[model samples]
Target: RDMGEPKLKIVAMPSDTNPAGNIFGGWILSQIDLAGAIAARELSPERVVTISMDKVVFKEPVFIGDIISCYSKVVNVGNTSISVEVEVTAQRVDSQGCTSCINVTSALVTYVSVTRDGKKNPISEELKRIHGF
Candidate 1:
């Protein structure tokens, strides 16, 4: 699950837990969205809005006190769209003081470059080239 530098990192808290005592799925999705947006924004400085999340698969449940790391990369760039892939990993220490890492989830998110007024804006070809997209 070594994708790249983590775009976001946070600790799972009690407030983010669900009825089953695991961290809420929606909370993890929100963090994924933020991480994907951060990767997309590198291609367009004006603004970027999430247009779609292609697919999300939750491989494992995250528990409270776990450290969550969101790794994202720009996968593709279109005329006005940028596709980002995000991988969420959780690090936990068991009672025995042994640390374990788990690949919790992954998502493919798409975003559109936009102006401040929310109008679609095309991504610059030079920037795309710079990113080798």
Candidate 2:
């Protein structure tokens, strides 16, 4: 944990689970998308779309009663796109006092800024300010 951090939280639900009663990887991936988009939205007011995701590693399984939290830091910025490194961790509700309640999953995802009509757009000056560019 760092000073003054922003962490994104999502709860695992029944719909997010697979037939085996574990959360689906795709559902977690979508949360990754949401996390990245929140970061991107902070960078710019424009709509953003995910271009690609790289180096995804799933280190643990998520069960029914877990809290999934995602943290993202911007890794790179292009003229119209930004790349973010995202880490997701899940903690069991019943394992509050456990030593290893958290499990991490990480990935790198790229997103492109777009116009209201969904056309490509340039990164705004606001983005540069928010991203410390």
User: lDDT winner among the candidates?
Assistant: 1
CA lDDT of 38 in candidate 2? Answer: 80
Cα-based RMSD of the predictions, in order?
Answer: 0.9, 2.3
Report the lDDT tens digits of candidate 1 across residue range 3-97. Answer: 67899999999999999899999999999999999989999987899999977999999999989999998888999999999999999999999
Model 2 stretches with alpha carbons more than 4 Å out: 3-7, 93-100
- Residue range 78-129, candidate 2, lDDT tens digits: 8889888888878775545663457568889999888878888888776687
Q: What is the lDDT of candidate 2?
A: 0.80
Q: Positional deviation of 133 in candidate 2, in angstroms?
A: 1.7
After aligning candidate 1 to the native by TM-score, how far in Å is the CA of 23 from where it should be? 0.3
For candidate 2, the per-residue lDDT at 58 reads: 89
| Candidate 1: stretches off by over 4 Å | none
Q: lDDT per model, in order?
A: 0.93, 0.80
